[PDB]
Amino acid sequence: KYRQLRDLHTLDSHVRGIKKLLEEQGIFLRASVVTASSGSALQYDTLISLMEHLKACAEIAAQRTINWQKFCIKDDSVLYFLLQVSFLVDEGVSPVLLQLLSCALCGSKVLAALAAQEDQLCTALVNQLNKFADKETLIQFLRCFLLESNSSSVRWQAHCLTLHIYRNSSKSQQELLLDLMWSIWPELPAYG
């Protein structure tokens, strides 16, 4: 129990800090949507203070994934918030956000195999993310992390994350996701 209390409190505090930091620069999460008032990019100090929190969260989620999954179940506005904020932050931080999403959704043993109760938690988290996320945000995620990214590791992470989001969904959401991908397809020549 002791490890669970420590981990839950630490992750809670880190999310409060991240939300306060983003609020300081005009990034507002009202009900479930993240809105930006200023089109100017963030500064180095803000990025480093974000990265320390996200690195702590990534380490704790990678060591003991169950507590992180339990957190994301308890607080329903965490995974979608990270997905939304991954659009506003430069390419230097996106790997850690994708790692957090992958640990929450793809699972721990799957990532361990790639390195060569959790199933129900993964299913529930995937259903929650499907419920919150709309079609435009999914389209933006696919376009931004599978086509526009110059790094190949980020593209592979997006590949795995999309695959495991597809695997754990229901039939109607699978059809919706396939239609989204097939509508993206005609824009292929722009990415080579």
Swiss-Prot record:
The chain holds residues 3223 to 3462 of 5183 of the full protein. The UBR-type zinc finger forms a pocket that mediates recognition of type 1 N-degrons. In addition to substrate-binding, the UBR-type zinc finger probably positions substrate proteins in the proximity of the bound and activated E2-ubiquitin conjugate to enable their ubiquitination. It is linked to Episodic ataxia 8: A form of episodic ataxia, a neurologic disorder characterized by episodes of poor coordination and balance. EA8 affected individuals have attacks of unsteadiness, general weakness, and slurred speech. Additional variable features include twitching around the eyes, nystagmus, myokymia, and persistent intention tremor. Inheritance is autosomal dominant. E3 ubiquitin-protein ligase involved in different protein quality control pathways in the cytoplasm. Component of the N-end rule pathway: ubiquitinates proteins bearing specific N-terminal residues that are destabilizing according to the N-end rule, leading to their degradation. Recognizes both type-1 and type-2 N-degrons, containing positively charged amino acids (Arg, Lys and His) and bulky and hydrophobic amino acids, respectively. Does not ubiquitinate proteins that are acetylated at the N-terminus. Component of the SIFI complex, composed of KCMF1, UBR4 and calmodulin (CALM1, CALM2 or CALM3). Interacts with E2 conjugating enzymes UBE2A and UBE2B. Interacts with RB1. (Microbial infection) Interacts with protein E7 from papilloma virus HPV-16, HPV-6B and HPV-11. Belongs to the UBR4 family. It is found in: Cytoplasm; Cytoplasm, Cytoskeleton; Nucleus. It comes from the Eukaryota. This is E3 ubiquitin-protein ligase UBR4.
